[PDB]
Write a protein that binds this ligand. Structure first.
Ligand SMILES: Nc1nc2c(ncn2[C@@H]2O[C@H](COP(=O)(O)OP(=O)(O)O)[C@@H](O)[C@H]2O)c(=O)[nH]1
Length: 171
């Protein structure tokens, strides 16, 4: 039998960066320009470590309830709009201030299928993530590229932090 984990996570980023589309791709495995949209649920098996994760995936007084109890998040920007890349630091700070602690974040450069209108280079997002010891993923909700991987990476990080805490409480 697999180990069982449960986490609330938050989708962060400016409007129209693809938070809903990424969540829809992850939980329903499709994409629709005309998808009409507080949380979605995903049950995910991680074979490598025989672990089963149940995720509550939250997506935008209200902000404090939005963040409360989150153990991780995806920090999205739209690679075709530099202003959304500039603002990921503001989202990180808002989340950390609301929670009064750091939580693991995976930096997600979304919409990479839009090659001809991309303005934020891969190396810029890698550098921001590296400065914060965040992982970095290039994703497309449209094609599905690396969408599951982004959530899976975050899941594994939260599981390792759960294990860390188990050890700290067991000295
Ligand atoms: N080409 C492309 N379009 C995307 C992608 N992700 C989202 N979109 C589109 O970008 C727009 C904004 O996405 P949405 O999910 O509403 O962003 P949200 O406001 O952050 O939840 C919608 O028209 C989506 O269909 C993507 O990965 N590639």
């Amino acid at each position: 039998m697999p180990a069982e984990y449960r986490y609330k996570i938050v989708m962060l980023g400016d409007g129209a960066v693809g938070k809903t589309a990424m969540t829809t791709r992850f939980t329903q495995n499709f994409f629709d320009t005309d998808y009409k949209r507080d949380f979605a649920v995903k049950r995910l098996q991680l074979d490598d470590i025989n672990a089963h994760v149940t995720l509550q995936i939250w997506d935008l007084s209200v902000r404090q309830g939005f963040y409360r109890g989150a153990r991780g998040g995806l920090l999205l920007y739209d690679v075709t709009r530099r202003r959304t890349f500039i603002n990921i630091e503001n989202w990180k700070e808002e989340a950390f201030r609301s929670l009064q602690k750091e939580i693991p974040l995976v930096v997600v450069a979304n919409k990479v299928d839009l090659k001809d209108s991309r303005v934020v280079a891969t190396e810029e997002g890698e550098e921001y993530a590296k400065n914060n010891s965040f992982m970095y993923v290039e994703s497309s909700a449209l094609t599905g590229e690396n969408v599951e991987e982004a959530y899976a990476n975050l899941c594994r990080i939260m599981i390792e932090e759960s294990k860390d805490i188990s050890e700290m409480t067991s000295t």
